[PDB]
Amino acid sequence: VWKDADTTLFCASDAKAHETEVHNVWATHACVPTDPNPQEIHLENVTENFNMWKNNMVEQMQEDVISLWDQSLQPCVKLTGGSVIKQACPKISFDPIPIHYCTPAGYVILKCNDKNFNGTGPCKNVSSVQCTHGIKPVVSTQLLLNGSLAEEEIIIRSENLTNNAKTIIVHLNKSVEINCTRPSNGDIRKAYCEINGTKWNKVLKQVTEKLKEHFNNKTIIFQPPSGGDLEITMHSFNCRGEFFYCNTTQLFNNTCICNGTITLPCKIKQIINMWQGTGQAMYAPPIDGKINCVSNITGILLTRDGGANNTSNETFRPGGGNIKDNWRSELYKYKVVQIE
Ligand SMILES: Cc1nc([C@H](CN)NC(=O)c2ccc(-c3ccc(Cl)c(F)c3)[nH]2)sc1CO
Ligand SMILES: *[C@@H]1O[C@H](CO)[C@@H](O)[C@H](O)[C@H]1NC(C)=O
Ligand SMILES: *[C@@H]1O[C@H](CO)[C@@H](O)[C@H](O)[C@H]1NC(C)=O
Ligand SMILES: *[C@@H]1O[C@H](CO)[C@@H](O)[C@H](O)[C@H]1NC(C)=O
Ligand SMILES: *[C@@H]1O[C@H](CO)[C@@H](O)[C@H](O)[C@H]1NC(C)=O
Ligand SMILES: *[C@@H]1O[C@H](CO)[C@@H](O)[C@H](O)[C@H]1NC(C)=O
Ligand SMILES: *[C@@H]1O[C@H](CO)[C@@H](O)[C@H](O)[C@H]1NC(C)=O
Ligand SMILES: *[C@@H]1O[C@H](CO)[C@@H](O)[C@H](O)[C@H]1NC(C)=O
Ligand SMILES: *[C@@H]1O[C@H](CO)[C@@H](O)[C@H](O)[C@H]1NC(C)=O
Ligand SMILES: *[C@@H]1O[C@H](CO)[C@@H](O)[C@H](O)[C@H]1NC(C)=O
Ligand SMILES: *[C@@H]1O[C@H](CO)[C@@H](O)[C@H](O)[C@H]1NC(C)=O
Ligand SMILES: *[C@@H]1O[C@H](CO)[C@@H](O)[C@H](O)[C@H]1NC(C)=O
Numbered sequence: 001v002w003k004d005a006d007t008t009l010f011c012a013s014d015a016k017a018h019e020t021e022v023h024n025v026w027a028t029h030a031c032v033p034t035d036p037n038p039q040e041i042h043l044e045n046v047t048e049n050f051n052m053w054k055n056n057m058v059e060q061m062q063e064d065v066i067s068l069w070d071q072s073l074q075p076c077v078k079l080t081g082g083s084v085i086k087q088a089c090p091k092i093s094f095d096p097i098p099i100h101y102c103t104p105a106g107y108v109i110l111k112c113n114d115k116n117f118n119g120t121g122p123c124k125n126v127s128s129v130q131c132t133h134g135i136k137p138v139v140s141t142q143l144l145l146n147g148s149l150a151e152e153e154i155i156i157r158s159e160n161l162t163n164n165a166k167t168i169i170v171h172l173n174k175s176v177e178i179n180c181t182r183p184s185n186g187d188i189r190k191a192y193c194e195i196n197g198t199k200w201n202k203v204l205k206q207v208t209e210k211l212k213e214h215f216n217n218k219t220i221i222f223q224p225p226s227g228g229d230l231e232i233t234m235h236s237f238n239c240r241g242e243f244f245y246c247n248t249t250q251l252f253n254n255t256c257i258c259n260g261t262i263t264l265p266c267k268i269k270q271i272i273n274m275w276q277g278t279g280q281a282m283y284a285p286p287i288d289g290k291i292n293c294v295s296n297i298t299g300i301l302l303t304r305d306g307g308a309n310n311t312s313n314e315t316f317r318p319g320g321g322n323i324k325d326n327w328r329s330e331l332y333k334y335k336v337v338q339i340e
Pocket of ligand 12: 162307309
């Protein structure tokens with residue numbers, strides 16, 4: 001017998017003690033090795049309630065990732081609460097690795113295996129595991145990168161769809177590659193991302209039809225963000241230690257829902273609003289040579305316009321900015337229980 005409970009998790013990973021890559025360094029000193037033959041027990045006739053939007057595992061992953069960035073990616077100047085801090089901002093080796101989250105003795109993780117589980121409510125096919133799957137701590141806005149794919153249909157996740165102030169996580173069932181490059185050869189901060197337009201527009205059409213199921217068949221419209229800070233009006237992510245900010249207007253145009261490569265204009269930014277919430281920071285300028293990251297788009301963060309109740313349209317804009325939602329998109333199926 002068991003009950004919902006919180007406890008300090010530990011982490012496991014396959015980090016390498018000889019790598020200078022910062023995720024490897026961090027996990028070498030903060031995690032243990034992975035279990036080569038992990039155990040999973042499928043519980044028959046067990047129904048468990050889950051709530052991805054109130055899951056202490058998300059807060060613990062946030063603290064790990066804040067910890068890793070604080071030790072790994074130091075800016076030159078840190079503008080934190082009225083004080084200036086100027087330190088060394090050396091260039092680093094940066095490429096996220098999967099991190100497993102694990103329960104100590106007396107606790108277990110219950111895992112929801114319902115194929116179209118939305119992250120809230122009862123789950124019929126539950127298993128018990130000691131550790132989650134490996135989760136890469138990818139910090140980004142607008143688009144979720146390099147995550148897991150939904151196994152059956154596209155899933156819409158929200159703490160409350162009727163509340164337009166709550167973020168929507170769209171969980172894709174098919175990857176769309178995004179290929180971002182600061183060319184070796186000029187403007188050292190100019191970059192771009194290439195996306196296969198046929199794939200993207202097919203997936204976005206499928207996202208439209210899913211949202212229709214949730215909004216009583218109203219007309220589904222995508223628009224670019226209206227206001228907000230740069231981090232949210234742009235698709236922002238970290239590639240090899242450099243901060244990329246990309247204009248996604250071409251992705252969220254309802255015209256094609258147009259085969260061909262979509263080229264998004266991007267810029268590498270040194271001056272950053274810190275997702276940790278600690279103010280602004282300036283990092284070092286870009287390394288020389290070709291800077292490139294090819295990622296899987298596996299999810300989308302959306303905000304829905306208010307004030308459309310008296311029309312047949314619902315308008316959705318790419319959003320995000322609460323990085324905890326990034327960890328929720330991978331942790332939604334897990335909860336910790338204590339074993340009696
Ligand atoms: C109350 C509060 N206000 C905050 C500010 C508002 N200005 N938000 C940020 O600073 C911010 C959000 C995301 C990012 C970011 C930066 C770089 C990259 Cl690559 C990236 F993917 C994401 N920054 S945070 C916070 C605490 O939750
Ligand atoms: C739960 O498992 C049964 C048997 O494998 C399957 O028929 C059913 O579709 C599953 N439910 C979900 C939500 O995946
Ligand atoms: C990207 O997606 C492909 C297929 O969707 C998958 O085989 C590959 O492992 C993914 N890479 C990631 C998630 O880093
Ligand atoms: C993805 O889900 C949609 C329904 O949301 C479905 O029509 C489509 O077949 C799925 N695609 C794949 C590749 O499973
Ligand atoms: C998720 O499923 C639960 C249970 O079926 C339901 O109460 C809730 O409205 C659903 N939420 C979303 C966002 O689909
Ligand atoms: C969800 O949000 C709507 C609109 O803001 C509100 O009327 C409703 O009570 C909320 N539902 C819950 C369960 O809080
Ligand atoms: C990404 O685009 C560059 C050109 O900008 C190309 O050289 C490279 O092969 C592409 N990578 C993939 C995986 O398509
Ligand atoms: C882009 O996606 C389409 C969709 O299947 C595919 O056929 C094509 O090979 C991809 N690459 C292109 C168009 O360069
Ligand atoms: C949308 O329309 C279809 C008719 O094609 C209907 O069967 C379905 O119930 C409608 N869904 C909603 C959410 O109104
Ligand atoms: C993105 O590009 C479009 C078209 O080039 C432009 O109108 C828009 O202002 C850009 N967005 C931002 C946030 O700069
Ligand atoms: C996604 O995974 C690929 C393959 O490991 C990696 O090269 C790329 O840099 C990752 N993207 C991000 C944004 O971390
Ligand atoms: C919009 O609709 C929601 C849910 O139907 C409702 O709770 C809210 O009061 C409406 N807003 C306005 C401004 O009428």
